[PDB]
């Protein structure tokens, strides 16, 4: 995250850190005790699928304070329409091997109904984006979880204001064109969270952009409203052998 601030410990309780052999991979979002939503592109180059770990209740990566909970990732589910190395349909649903325990520091974000998300949430101007990604373009990643308030654009206005891949109906833009404030590579997969009447909801996934905080460009986020029904169906399904699952979309 560029141009944000430290999320106070416990104020981003749905944030997930994904690790591969101990190393930072991506962020994600807890949406109930065993399911995490992340970006498909985070998994393009995975070697050993059996060393993927999700950590909840994380804040300062330099220390252990006892609020962290780690789980193995039992399943990574990606839509059939996702093509590795490209930007469209950038969403993954991850099943944890054992539930996390909800606590003051570990709470899921609400996965909204589609209609509510499209008719109401899509019109809330500002939303929060978070992660332990780069603090600057070409710079070091964060040791403490960072957060940034970013405004959403209608895609017509995004394209008019930008100066790439297409912005599809499965995406939306948010942020700033002056190069001051953005999510960044290492924030991939993390939440774009939207407040409405006292409750926060999952509306986007940190997906892609041009460099980070590049003048003339906005952040591009996966439009989670397009995937509610797909996610809900998968969350009712039985696990299948083998970590990676490609599931039909729609």
């Amino acid at each position: 995250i560029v141009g944000g601030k430290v999320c106070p410990k416990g104020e981003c309780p749905w944030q997930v850190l994904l690790l591969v052999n101990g190393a930072q991979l991506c962020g994600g979002t807890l949406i109930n005790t065993i399911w995490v939503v992340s970006a498909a592109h985070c998994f393009d180059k995975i070697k050993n699928w059996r060393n993927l770990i999700a950590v909840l209740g994380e804040h300062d990566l330099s220390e252990h304070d006892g609020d962290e909970q780690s789980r193995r990732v039992a399943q990574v589910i990606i839509p059939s329409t996702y093509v590795p190395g490209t930007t469209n349909h950038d969403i993954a649903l991850l099943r944890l091997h054992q539930p996390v325990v909800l606590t003051d520091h570990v709470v899921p974000l609400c996965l909204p109904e589609r209609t509510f998300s499209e008719r109401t949430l899509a019109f809330v101007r500002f939303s929060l984006v978070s992660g332990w990604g780069q603090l600057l373009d070409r710079g070091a990643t964060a040791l403490e979880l960072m957060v940034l308030n970013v405004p959403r654009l209608m895609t017509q206005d995004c394209l008019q204001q930008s100066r790439s891949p297409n912005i599809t109906e499965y995406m939306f833009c948010a942020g700033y064109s002056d190069g001051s404030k953005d999510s960044c590579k290492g924030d991939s997969g993390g939440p774009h969270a939207t407040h409405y009447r006292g409750t926060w909801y999952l509306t986007g996934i940190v997906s892609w952009g041009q460099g980070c905080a590049t003048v003339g460009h906005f952040g591009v986020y996966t439009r989670v409203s397009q995937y509610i029904e797909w996610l809900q169906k998968l969350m009712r399904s039985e696990p299948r052998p083998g970590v990676l699952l490609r599931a039909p979309f729609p």
Binding site: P8, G10, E11, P13, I31, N32, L102, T103, D104, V107, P108, L109, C110, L111, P112, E113, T115, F116, R119, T120, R197, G198, T199, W200, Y201
Partner: protein, 56 residues
């Protein structure tokens, strides 16, 4: 009321029905109050709420 305007007056989710009818609904971990619009937690850690801030 209609769900596309002002969220049908609902705090959370909204369904249109046949007639000038509307039903509000709540996410798991919440229940709907007698006003027919408001949602109150039914569990300790409902989704989308931040405990340290709810405590204050």
């Amino acid at each position: 009321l209609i769900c596309v305007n002002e969220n049908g007056g609902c705090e959370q989710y909204c369904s249109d029905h046949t007639g000038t009818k509307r039903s509000c609904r709540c996410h798991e971990g919440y229940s709907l109050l007698a006003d027919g619009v408001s949602c109150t937690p039914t569990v300790e850690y409902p989704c989308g709420k931040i405990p340290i801030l709810e405590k204050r």
